[PDB]
Design an enzyme around this catalytic site. Structure first.
Site, PDB file in Angstrom:
ATOM      1  N   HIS A 295       2.473   5.547   9.914  1.00 45.13           N
ATOM      2  CA  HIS A 295       1.599   4.422   9.610  1.00 45.13           C
ATOM      3  C   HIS A 295       0.680   3.889  10.712  1.00 45.13           C
ATOM      4  O   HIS A 295       1.068   3.808  11.879  1.00 45.13           O
ATOM      5  CB  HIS A 295       2.538   3.315   9.111  1.00 45.13           C
ATOM      6  CG  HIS A 295       1.889   2.245   8.295  1.00 45.13           C
ATOM      7  ND1 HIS A 295       0.961   1.364   8.814  1.00 45.13           N
ATOM      8  CD2 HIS A 295       2.114   1.844   7.021  1.00 45.13           C
ATOM      9  CE1 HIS A 295       0.649   0.465   7.897  1.00 45.13           C
ATOM     10  NE2 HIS A 295       1.334   0.734   6.800  1.00 45.13           N
TER      11      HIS A 295
ATOM     12  N   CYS B  32       0.836  -1.193   0.000  1.00 42.73           N
ATOM     13  CA  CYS B  32       0.000   0.000   0.000  1.00 42.73           C
ATOM     14  C   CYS B  32       0.873   1.246   0.000  1.00 42.73           C
ATOM     15  O   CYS B  32       0.554   2.238  -0.649  1.00 42.73           O
ATOM     16  CB  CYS B  32      -0.917   0.023   1.229  1.00 42.73           C
ATOM     17  SG  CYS B  32      -0.077  -0.135   2.832  1.00 42.73           S
TER      18      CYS B  32
HETATM   19  N1  LIG Z   1      -3.013  -2.031   5.498  1.00 43.57           N
HETATM   20  C1  LIG Z   1      -2.748  -3.347   5.311  1.00 43.57           C
HETATM   21  O1  LIG Z   1      -3.040  -4.140   6.195  1.00 43.57           O
HETATM   22  C2  LIG Z   1      -2.103  -3.806   4.027  1.00 43.57           C
HETATM   23  C3  LIG Z   1      -1.787  -2.848   3.025  1.00 43.57           C
HETATM   24  C4  LIG Z   1      -1.185  -3.253   1.818  1.00 43.57           C
HETATM   25  C5  LIG Z   1      -0.906  -4.594   1.618  1.00 43.57           C
HETATM   26  N2  LIG Z   1      -1.200  -5.513   2.558  1.00 43.57           N
HETATM   27  C6  LIG Z   1      -0.845  -6.911   2.198  1.00 43.57           C
HETATM   28  O2  LIG Z   1      -1.832  -7.912   2.613  1.00 43.57           O
HETATM   29  C7  LIG Z   1      -1.167  -8.886   3.490  1.00 43.57           C
HETATM   30  C8  LIG Z   1      -1.655  -8.590   4.896  1.00 43.57           C
HETATM   31  O3  LIG Z   1      -3.014  -8.886   5.172  1.00 43.57           O
HETATM   32  P1  LIG Z   1      -3.199  -8.390   6.724  1.00 43.57           P
HETATM   33  O4  LIG Z   1      -4.064  -7.315   7.435  1.00 43.57           O
HETATM   34  O5  LIG Z   1      -2.765  -6.981   6.203  1.00 43.57           O
HETATM   35  O6  LIG Z   1      -4.629  -9.093   6.628  1.00 43.57           O
HETATM   36  P2  LIG Z   1      -4.868 -10.107   7.969  1.00 43.57           P
HETATM   37  O7  LIG Z   1      -5.892  -9.093   8.229  1.00 43.57           O
HETATM   38  O8  LIG Z   1      -3.320  -9.960   8.339  1.00 43.57           O
HETATM   39  O9  LIG Z   1      -5.171 -11.294   6.908  1.00 43.57           O
HETATM   40  C9  LIG Z   1      -5.528 -12.303   7.828  1.00 43.57           C
HETATM   41  C10 LIG Z   1      -5.960 -13.635   7.244  1.00 43.57           C
HETATM   42  O10 LIG Z   1      -4.959 -14.448   6.506  1.00 43.57           O
HETATM   43  C11 LIG Z   1      -5.453 -15.820   6.748  1.00 43.57           C
HETATM   44  N3  LIG Z   1      -4.510 -16.935   6.393  1.00 43.57           N
HETATM   45  C12 LIG Z   1      -3.299 -17.250   6.987  1.00 43.57           C
HETATM   46  N4  LIG Z   1      -2.767 -18.305   6.414  1.00 43.57           N
HETATM   47  C13 LIG Z   1      -3.580 -18.739   5.415  1.00 43.57           C
HETATM   48  C14 LIG Z   1      -3.544 -19.825   4.475  1.00 43.57           C
HETATM   49  N5  LIG Z   1      -2.466 -20.704   4.458  1.00 43.57           N
HETATM   50  N6  LIG Z   1      -4.573 -19.965   3.590  1.00 43.57           N
HETATM   51  C15 LIG Z   1      -5.627 -19.124   3.595  1.00 43.57           C
HETATM   52  N7  LIG Z   1      -5.703 -18.099   4.466  1.00 43.57           N
HETATM   53  C16 LIG Z   1      -4.722 -17.877   5.392  1.00 43.57           C
HETATM   54  C17 LIG Z   1      -5.687 -15.781   8.276  1.00 43.57           C
HETATM   55  O11 LIG Z   1      -6.481 -16.848   8.796  1.00 43.57           O
HETATM   56  C18 LIG Z   1      -6.429 -14.460   8.414  1.00 43.57           C
HETATM   57  O12 LIG Z   1      -7.853 -14.589   8.361  1.00 43.57           O
HETATM   58  C19 LIG Z   1       0.321  -8.570   3.525  1.00 43.57           C
HETATM   59  O13 LIG Z   1       1.115  -9.638   2.997  1.00 43.57           O
HETATM   60  C20 LIG Z   1       0.532  -7.274   2.753  1.00 43.57           C
HETATM   61  O14 LIG Z   1       1.498  -7.401   1.720  1.00 43.57           O
HETATM   62  C21 LIG Z   1      -1.786  -5.177   3.756  1.00 43.57           C
END
Ligand SMILES: NC(=O)c1ccc[n+]([C@@H]2O[C@H](COP(=O)([O-])OP(=O)(O)OC[C@H]3O[C@@H](n4cnc5c(N)ncnc54)[C@H](O)[C@@H]3O)[C@@H](O)[C@H]2O)c1
Ligand SMILES: NC(=O)c1ccc[n+]([C@@H]2O[C@H](COP(=O)([O-])OP(=O)(O)OC[C@H]3O[C@@H](n4cnc5c(N)ncnc54)[C@H](O)[C@@H]3O)[C@@H](O)[C@H]2O)c1
Ligand SMILES: NC(=O)c1ccc[n+]([C@@H]2O[C@H](COP(=O)([O-])OP(=O)(O)OC[C@H]3O[C@@H](n4cnc5c(N)ncnc54)[C@H](O)[C@@H]3O)[C@@H](O)[C@H]2O)c1
Ligand SMILES: NC(=O)c1ccc[n+]([C@@H]2O[C@H](COP(=O)([O-])OP(=O)(O)OC[C@H]3O[C@@H](n4cnc5c(N)ncnc54)[C@H](O)[C@@H]3O)[C@@H](O)[C@H]2O)c1
Lengths: 336, 336, 336, 336
Positions: C180, C153
């Site tokens: 952040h 992001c």
């Molecule tokens: N603001 C942000 O949070 C943001 C911004 C940009 C990019 N991202 C990207 O998204 C990803 C992060 O997500 P997080 O908040 O940010 O979301 P979470 O809210 O960290 O995502 C969580 C989910 O991933 C699921 N999960 C874990 N292992 C799994 C598997 N083997 N198969 C299927 N599902 C599984 C978990 O059970 C959980 O429900 C990062 O890798 C990042 O690059 C996040």
């Protein structure tokens, strides 16, 4: 052709009450008075909100500084210090929402009549203006009463709940606690609050005990409960949305399911819109924007036995109350 | 001879300046003025602190409505709105800390001399009183000057840092950002702030940008840097401790390790007690209670190349500065 | 002819990407995989949201384990642990959004092809999967590539802005700081975080320095900026919405007003929808739900001189990025 | 005759129990096991604390891969996930504090015996291991018992208070609410919490209802109160320190002063060090570092009548309980 109202003050309540009005089919906000906020600043404070999002139901623009324009509809802006000198009549304001918090006394609130207003609704408790809570005693209002109070957000949450429980099971005695969101009277860092020392301590970094008159007030709008309820409050680090924790001993034995069904029926009955019923795993933010006065949380409460139970009810302290202010004006206007 | 001091404005700074003084062996707090905090209330505000813990060095009790008593030692208390009416002389206060935030102008600050004070130290930048930063330019103070400014906590954080960087590598240009804790001027919920709209928005629920002349001010205590620095700030949801983020272009090429070594040496020598040096994975709360003006965080910073880098320095905006207020007084008292 | 997609990992990004998809006329969410949340629990996590509100666009119900109904449109639910066993082809998902965060390597992401998916979009930076940022280099994508990364992001916020400044004024060098919001990898109270010690400390009670490769990554989507940008981050106690602070040295002299007009033009042209432009006194919550990748804050930034400036740009790290994941898919689908 | 202890689980409780032991004169920490924290990382986690400040009683250095060295006192570090395998006897650990939160079952905690420990104190309620609360029933302990539970912090706060009120006035029935600080099991942003959906919601941006058996558990340590108490909890946005809100119907009529007096007497007599008594306008942060199990807040509570009242008692959920873990151990050693 629409109930004309004016708002004195433009804080959290005045602004949200204005939102409710500006989006209704039956009430017309004709003017707002506020000595401290320039017309330009007013538009900004109204448009953006940390809690309730950007106003997007209509665009905002300045016609001429003595004037706001909400989607082609005019709203006069007064900057008068003396209520006694607000020309409410020049704008056509029939009802005036006294929401500044310093004219809660009937005789002080009465000043708005001087400028031609016919009715004044104090958006806070009052020591001498009659209090009315929708769903509880609004029917007690009569046309010869010109100055009224819509009580407090907390009393609006407690009263409907207590009425339902009392009417169904009979409340012997009860103690109440509200886990409350911080408010404008609190401080960001430890500061002076001579009338409430705890209240001067850093708001978002402490759990802060506080007194409450909501339980006692219930006795005013429901005489049958006078002296049977009292309580206190805990101010916690949240921006909005509060919860009422009511512990009561009841005279008629009732299972938790029976209590739940009673509240449920009421929420689907004549108290729809006032009392809400929920049975899901919700938390505070799930209630932001909820217009009800009291949302019963079925899963959160717990009973020790059929005559002693702890009940939980949520309330968006800012938005629920704001809707009740307009709801009260609507009832008043329908009363001959 | 024990330096006798008075404090005007018993707030976050006023109270902490009191703690540093009451714990020292060379400064004696003799009186305090604050029309918003009765004597009784003062014992409570000084004893308990959300951030800096409970005062446990001596006992705190009231002798009478006009005098406190910190472990037997008497501190007179006034409740006067107009500085020129404070009888500082009667209490023997030679130096007066002006920490109310509303008397930073030289002529407003000089009102204290009318009552008998001999020197006034404004706990904030001043429009016309000379500004001094310990470790950077306190030695420019001359005893014919009676009213002075100790600058802002931010300038106190950045100036010592810039001095080391400039003396060692020569600053060509720099831009600063401070990620700053919330303060007393902010609001718990969206409220009016006519001179800083963003500053009126709910403090602990928003990242709030704000202008600051703290970076530009470095040019006043270090003239050689005039016109070479400026920047801005982001107020964030923390109760205390802030951090300087300085992006600077230097003339003499230097590796990050060379820059680190320069700062470490400065912290162990000439600027010991002013500039601190850390190389651990610390976070804001770890710096609460730190008395230094600028704590360089080796691991947090990053260099793009040998002449362009981002430097990071922490500062307990309340505590470090409070200690510098006392240090400035100590220096003026030793002058001549 | 809707674009059929599937989502792996139902977290902050996964759920919000689902919301964007479900609201579009464009794409159709046909399946979701998450072995860490039951089908019933899945409906709850998707319905209620602390920052983005309750889903009220359509009704949400369970048809039978493995199957959700959002109104009248079915969504298959998987609970597979290994990506190479999700039969995406059975549900008809052509595009898979890899949002678990633990399968960013191009090889590991390729597992979805095994189940019949045609393309995989990694919702995160990848060590080797081709990176694309909408509005910056999405035109570089070629149909023979089946596994791509949508970057982070932060890079989606920094890259568009940087492209606009570089093409108009020529960036020589810059350092970036991002203030952040906290994220799922952080902790509520001091806990274990082996690869990031600072990141283990209490999230909402500290300003926490962090490393970021977002600035360096810009070099992958804009070759001429490779090695010209780097930076770091400060995680602060807010739930969502972050801000980029870019300090840059430019080739071509330009007044802050020239820089502003350049960004405004871009926000009104091709980059409309990706880059935003505001010149009001806004704060973080004002950007919750903003779909743009980078919203330039005109009034927050500051220039030292015509060749050295600090630019600030907001971004709802959760929402803007989620929309970009769909925009990338939209572009890939329209590619020969 | 130093009491030699080992700690399994270096989390909030394990680390603070460690601080108590290391600052004591009668207890000797000889070993710590935690396979989720390396010896190097362990020094960092023990030294710096967001809530309780930096460790300063002693230097903390590393004597090889296993032993830490605290003020010249060696402490062996283990990194073993299976309890059955920890060689406690090798370090000389007679008593093991089971603070991982995943071996609360008597049979599972028993695993520490195979390694040579002679006693195990579970820092949490247990379904079958005998529970004890200092000041309430620790004297019920007998040497033939090798596995015990120190119950929960909430039960440790409610039990002493209940004992006093019950011995003095007779508790007919009671309902409790605890306004509790966030803990390690909560989430920074809406995340998965299968066994507790509400608990998955962003911890510091919501008031979160929570079930608790802490009140019912008073019946285990105080048989006469079996079935006489129950209640629930509200998790709120604070880092540490919680509060009990007990609503009770009592048998002997007693004015609020008589109640205050009874508790104060208890705090100065038999329950000194267990129950505290305050009569000032305190807030949560004022109790950080307080070692008492339950601190009665005279001014916060309220009485409806002489037989129905609401009592308030604070507790540093981290520090109070940690001290009690050591006290239980001291009692066991003195009754060997
Ligand atoms: N603001 C942000 O949070 C943001 C911004 C940009 C990019 N991202 C990207 O998204 C990803 C992060 O997500 P997080 O908040 O940010 O979301 P979470 O809210 O960290 O995502 C969580 C989910 O991933 C699921 N999960 C874990 N292992 C799994 C598997 N083997 N198969 C299927 N599902 C599984 C978990 O059970 C959980 O429900 C990062 O890798 C990042 O690059 C996040
Ligand atoms: N959740 C709630 O905030 C809540 C709930 C129930 C009731 N209330 C009631 O509403 C009042 C509080 O409003 P606050 O948030 O809650 O709103 P604010 O948000 O505290 O109201 C602020 C406004 O009042 C204006 N004002 C001050 N003095 C004025 C004057 N002399 N004339 C005109 N305007 C003036 C200020 O300029 C400011 O714009 C209280 O008295 C309370 O009884 C508030
Ligand atoms: N971290 C910081 O807060 C910090 C750091 C560096 C400098 N400062 C400087 O300190 C100020 C210090 O404010 P605090 O000290 O931060 O805010 P406070 O904590 O808001 O200052 C509080 C006190 O000033 C008193 N006061 C107001 N008017 C007065 C009067 N007429 N006479 C006597 N007392 C009066 C108030 O009653 C109150 O007790 C500012 O001007 C600022 O620039 C603050
Ligand atoms: N304020 C409080 O948090 C509080 C108060 C009273 C009681 N408690 C109780 O004690 C826990 C207190 O846990 P905490 O909050 O101190 O824990 P943390 O703060 O969540 O405990 C963390 C540690 O346990 C370690 N651990 C996990 N599995 C392990 C294993 N198999 N072997 C060795 N170490 C392991 C983890 O690495 C982690 O460092 C609970 O079970 C609860 O009932 C907590």
């Amino acid at each position: 052709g629409k109930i004309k109202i004016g708002i004195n003050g433009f804080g959290r309540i005045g602004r949200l009450v204005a939102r409710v009005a500006l989006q209704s089919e039956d009430v017309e906000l004709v003017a707002v008075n506020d000595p401290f906020i320039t017309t330009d600043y007013m538009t900004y404070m109204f448009k953006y909100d940390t809690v309730h999002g950007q106003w997007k139901h209509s665009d905002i623009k300045i016609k001429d500084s003595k004037t706001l324009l909400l989607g082609e509809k005019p709203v006069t802006v007064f900057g008068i210090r003396n209520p006694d000198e607000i020309p409410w009549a020049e704008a056509g304001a029939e009802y005036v929402v006294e929401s500044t918090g310093v004219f809660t006394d009937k005789e002080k609130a009465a000043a708005h009549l001087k400028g031609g207003a016919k009715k004044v609704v104090i958006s806070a408790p009052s020591k001498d203006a009659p209090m009315f809570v929708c769903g509880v005693n609004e029917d007690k209002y009569t046309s010869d009463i010109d100055i009224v109070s819509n009580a407090s957000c907390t009393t609006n949450c407690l009263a409907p709940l207590a009425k339902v429980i009392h009417d169904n099971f009979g409340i012997i005695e009860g103690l109440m606690t509200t886990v409350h969101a911080i408010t404008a009277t609190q401080k960001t860092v430890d500061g002076p609050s001579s009338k409430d020392w705890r209240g001067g301590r850093a708001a978002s970094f402490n759990i802060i005990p506080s007194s409450t008159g909501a339980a006692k007030a219930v006795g005013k709008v429901l005489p049958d409960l006078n002296g049977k309820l009292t309580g206190m409050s805990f101010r916690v680090p949240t921006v909005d949305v509060s919860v009422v924790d009511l512990t009561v001993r009841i005279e008629k034995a009732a299972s938790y399911d029976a209590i739940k069904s009673a509240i449920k029926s009421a929420s689907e009955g004549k108290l729809k819109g006032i009392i809400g019923y929920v049975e899901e795993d919700l938390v505070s933010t799930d209630f932001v924007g909820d217009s009800r006065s009291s949302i019963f949380d079925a899963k959160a409460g717990i009973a020790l036995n059929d005559n002693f139970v702890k009940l939980v009810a949520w309330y968006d302290n800012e938005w629920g109350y704001s809707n009740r202010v307009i709801d009260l004006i609507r009832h008043m206007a329908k009363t001959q």
